[PDB]
Amino acid sequence: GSPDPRAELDSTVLLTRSLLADTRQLAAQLRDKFPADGDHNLDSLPTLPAIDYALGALQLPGVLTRLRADLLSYLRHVQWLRRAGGSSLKTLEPELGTLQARLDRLLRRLQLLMSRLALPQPPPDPPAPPLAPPSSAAGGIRAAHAILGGLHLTLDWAVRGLLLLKTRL
């Protein structure tokens, strides 16, 4: 019947938290295997979404639309990573592929949430060209740290924004 937005948000936030946990674990696996010099630029990829720290600005339709766009970008980068990452990354390949599948599940839940709540369809941003292969095996590892680190932050700030937004419904 008629949807309860608080329940729809709850189930969407819960699923987001699970993906956040998966991402946090995989980033830790990678860091444990490549401690290197500590940390590298999360800006090591200019093609990834920027992190939106501005809470209280956007409303629910806008927050959801931008999250959908961000997640689709992360899915593109994860798919790219699994293909051209190199031998160094294939020890993470099962977890990466499961992360990609759960990323798709969250995208579908967001699409369902927007349909159930009658929120106008997000305008499709034109398609970015294919991601070029990393210039080196090290470059692929740096890309993996940036992709997983950025996804974690995106999901963390989405949970925060959706919970503070639900507080007012």
Numbering used by the authors: 10 to 178
What text appears in the publication on this structure?
Interleukin (IL-), an IL-6 family cytokine, has pivotal roles in autoimmune diseases, fibrotic complications, and solid cancers. IL-11 activates downstream signalling pathways by binding its two cell surface receptors: the IL-11 specific receptor, IL-11Rα, and the signal-transducing receptor, glycoprotein (gp)13013,26. Following the formation of the receptor complex, the Janus kinase (JAK)/signal transducer and activator of stat (STAT) and extracellular signal regulated kinase (ERK)/mitogen-activated protein kinase (MAPK) pathways are primarily activated. IL-11 and IL-6 utilise a homodimer of gp13026,34,35 while other IL-6 family members exploit a heterodimer of gp130 with a second signal-transducing receptor, such as LIF receptor (LIFR), OSM receptor (OSMR), IL-27R/WSX-1 or IL-12 receptor β−2 subunit (IL-12Rβ2).
Phage display was subsequently used to identify variants with higher inhibitory potency resulting in IL-11 Mutein, which contains W147A combined with mutations of AB loop residues 58–62, 58AMSAG62 to 58PAIDY62, that were reported to increase affinity to IL-11Rα43. We solved crystal structures of IL-11Δ10/Mutein and IL-11Δ10/W147A at resolutions of 1.8 Å and 1.5 Å, respectively, to understand the structural consequences of the mutations. The structure of IL-11Δ10/W147A is similar to the structure of IL-11Δ10 (RMSD 0.3 Å relative to IL-11Δ1049), indicating that the W147A mutation does not alter the structure. In contrast, the AB loop of IL-11Δ10/Mutein shows significant conformational shifts relative to the WT structure caused by alterations in key contacts between the loop and the four-α-helical bundle. Thus, the 58PAIDY62 mutations alter the position of the AB-loop, shifting the register of key loop-core interactions by three residues, while maintaining the composition of the interacting residues. This register change is due to a shift of the LX(S/T)LP motif that mediates loop-core contacts: In IL-11Δ10 and IL-11Δ10/W147A the motif is 51LDSLP55, while in IL-11Δ10/Mutein the interacting motif is 54LPTLP58. The result is that the bulk of the loop is shifted toward site-III and the N-terminal turn of helix-B is unfolded. We note that this configuration of the C-terminal segment of the AB-loop and N-terminal turn of helix-B resembles the structure of wild-type IL-11Δ10 bound within the hexameric complex. In combination, these results indicate that that both IL-11Δ10/W147A and IL-11Δ10/PAIDY can mediate assembly of the hexameric signalling complex, albeit to differing extents, while formation of site III interactions by IL-11Δ10/Mutein is abrogated, and assembly is stalled at the trimer stage.
